[PDB]
Each structure stands twice: as C-alpha cells, then as structure tokens.
C-alpha cells in the first residue's frame, strides 16, 4: 500500500527527468541543510521488492548504516535521493532498475530489472574530517577532473572566499605556492587541504582553531585569535613541485640556499610552521644522496646539518620537543660534537622532564665549549627541577595512598 502512494504522487528528483527516482516525505526534518558530495551520511532503512517482500533492512539490526554520499558507494537512486533530504527526515523512494541494479540485478536477493522500494531515515550527516582531528571539515560542491593532487611546493591558481562568523573578509583569485600561504594572507589550513584537492574541485572548508590564523588572529581582516573560519576554495589549476629524484644535485644545491634563506626569514618573523616547511625541503632533497663530488658532498652536508639544527630550533619554539630531539639526533648523527645540536637536545629533554638524559647533553656541551656559561646554569637547573619532580611525585603518591585507604576503608557498609 505505501508503494502505490509514491507511484501515484512522487517527486521526480532525477536530473534527466525520466520518473526513475520518485520521493514522498513521510516525516519532515529540522534544519534547511541537505548533505553534499563526500559527506559521511548516517541512515536507517527498510528495503522491499516490487511485490512487497522485505529483502534487506537496517531496522532489523536497529544499528545504522554509515556511507559516503555521492561516492558511488550505493545505487544511483540513493546518491540522488539522500542528497535532497533534511536531518531526521523519513522518505519513501521508488527506484527504477535503471537507477538501481539494472538488468543484472543482485541475485538471489534482487531480480532482473527490479523496481525497488525503500524507507530511508537520515539519522545524521557530517562533512569529511580531512585529518580526523576536526581541524578541517570539507564539504564538496564540485568533483575535480583531477588524476593527481598538488604537493607541498606546487604553484596553484585558486579562487578564495573567506568568512568569519558569516562576515566575508576575503574574496579573490589568488596565485601562490602550497606551503607558503602566509605570503598571500592565506591560513595554513588551505595549503593542507589543497594537497587533498583535485583540479576543478569546488569545496567548502571549515578551518578550526588550529588550521586558521591562530593565537595572533588576522588584524587586517578583523579576525580575532583562534577564530573559526569558513572558506570556499576552487582549485582552478596547479603545477606540481619537482620530486626529490626529479632534481639533479646542481638544482638541489641551488634550491637549498633559496629555501634555507626563505626558512630563516620565516623563523625571524616568528612564523615557525612555515620555517619547518622550508627547511624540511633541504632534508627531503639531500639526506639520502650518494655518489657526489668532493665539493658537492661538503656543500650538501653543510645545508643538511644547518636544516637539522634550524628545525630543532623551530620545534623547540613550536613546543614540539620530541621532533626537536629527533632533529638534534639527526644533526648529531652528521656532527657528533655540534654544540647547538647537543644543547638544543638538552633543552627539549629538560622540557620533556628527562632530567638525567638532559644533564648528559648539557655536560657533553661543556666537553665541547667549556666557556659556555648557559650549559652550567642548565645543569644546576636540571638538578633543581629534578628534585622538585620527585617531591611532587612523592606527594601525589602519598595523597593517592590516602585516597585508596580513606575511601577504600568505607567499602564495608
């Protein structure tokens, strides 16, 4: 009986307009937001054949089915269907075999050229979380024609629209290098999202506090610190960066100086995120190289040790002390006696509360330069801060001994 209702009065939601997909809303939904391409759609459904036989159902599990809409993960009719729905909506869909399983069917469950009936409940729908942290939520307007995505260093031609609490502060066609958005007053989020974008892609991006302009805000755009930004990006075109192996040593050494200088500029400016990117290019290009001239090898090693020591500096200032120790380890690999490498290692280790580990680093610094006043002060700092850590640990333990004895004693009545 509810199958004849949609067959009589049904909304032909097809692009081609051939009565292939007909809808009838059973229960309306709140909000005027409809799901877009690539969104993670949560639904509840019941499937009945042409005669009325219940073939497959989610309600006969009570657990919802989650899939990505407009990604060809479901029948043609469903990708067209669910796209027109509001949240909490219940609608009855009548699907022609042309928009279902065709003449082929899905035997033994679905017959050949079968007109299927569905009851779909749009439970919830979320946009694509690009880095699974909630920092970049993408909603796709248009699919790209792309075969390759731009890479960190690619020059891109894009159209950019930016809103902060509904207010548009940016609306322009801009050309820049992926990784170097700051140069064109573009937040790091765009560069990061562009690497997951295709040529001719049109998408909405919700830039959370971490992928926006951050703690400083963007005073010229009247954007406050850690404000949430919504951008509309269209990747008009791009030209990918040469891969590490696509460049000869001559190019790599020319580019090493440019990106090192560019990295130092970023560093002095306090744009440490962008400094890490520039120096990281030197590491990517020269770390594994072999079969170089005496002059080429000595030069490559100079840039490589500089990049590692500078990256340690960046990571310390970025409060990312593990990466800082990692870089110091690489640098000390190349130059086992490097003062800066040893010192910066002690700095990050003292900060990760690895006092005795850090003590040694500052001690090994004095072994190199004994006239370094700062290593001596940090050795006595390691001593003082390690004594504080044990007293604090002793107190927490003595109080948790109290808790698991004054509360655990009440476990009688």
């Amino acid at each position: 009986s509810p199958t004849a209702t949609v067959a009589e009065q049904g909304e032909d939601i097809t692009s081609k307009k051939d009565r292939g997909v007909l809808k009838i809303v059973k229960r309306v939904g709140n909000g005027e937001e409809t799901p877009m391409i690539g969104d993670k759609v949560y639904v509840h459904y019941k499937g009945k054949l042409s005669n009325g036989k219940k073939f497959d159902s989610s309600h006969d599990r009570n657990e919802p089915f989650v899939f990505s809409l407009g990604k060809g993960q479901v029948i043609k009719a469903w990708d067209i269907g669910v796209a027109t729905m509001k949240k909490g909506e219940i609608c009855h869909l009548l699907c022609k075999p042309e928009y279902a399983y065709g003449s082929a069917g899905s035997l033994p469950k679905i017959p050949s050229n079968a007109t299927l009936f569905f009851e779909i409940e749009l439970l919830d729908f979320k946009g694509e979380d690009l880095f699974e942290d909630g920092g970049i939520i993408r909603r796709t307007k248009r699919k790209g024609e792309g075969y390759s995505n731009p890479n960190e260093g690619a020059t891109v031609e894009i159209h950019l629209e930016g809103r902060c609490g509904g207010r548009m502060f940016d609306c322009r066609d801009v050309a820049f290098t992926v990784g170097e958005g700051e140069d064109h007053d573009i937040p790091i989020g765009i560069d990061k999202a562009l690497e997951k974008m295709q040529r001719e892609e049109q998408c909405i991006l919700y830039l959370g506090p971490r992928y926006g302009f951050g703690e400083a805000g963007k005073p010229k755009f009247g954007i406050e610190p850690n404000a949430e930004l919504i951008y509309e990006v269209t990747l008009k075109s791009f030209e990918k960066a040469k891969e590490s192996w696509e460049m000869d040593t001559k190019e790599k050494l020319e580019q090493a100086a440019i990106v090192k200088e560019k990295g130092t500029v970023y560093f002095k400016g306090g744009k440490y995120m962008q400094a890490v990117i520039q120096y990281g290019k030197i590491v990517s290009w020269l770390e594994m190289e072999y079969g170089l001239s005496e002059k080429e090898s000595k030069a490559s090693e100079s840039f490589l040790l500089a990049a590692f020591l500078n990256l340690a500096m960046c990571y310390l200032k970025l409060r990312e002390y593990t990466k800082a120790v990692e870089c110091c380890d690489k640098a000390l690999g190349l130059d086992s006696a490097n003062e800066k490498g040893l010192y910066r290692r002690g700095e990050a280790q003292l900060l990760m509360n690895e006092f005795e580990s850090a003590k040694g680093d500052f001690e090994k610094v004095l072994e190199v330069n004994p006239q370094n006043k700062a290593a001596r002060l940090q050795i006595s700092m390691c001593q003082k801060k390690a004594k504080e850590h044990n007293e604090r640990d002793r107190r927490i333990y003595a109080n948790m001994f109290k808790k698991f004895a004054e509360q655990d004693a009440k476990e009688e009545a």
């Binding site: 130092t264 002095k268 020591l309 500096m313 003062e339 800066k340 910066r344 370094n372 006043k373």
Partner: peptide, 9 residues
Amino acid sequence: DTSRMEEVD
C-alpha cells in the same frame, strides 16, 4: 650572552 644557542644557521 650565550644567546648563540638561539641563533639559526
């Protein structure tokens, strides 16, 4: 004055 440990290369 041992601010060298803050200087970049």
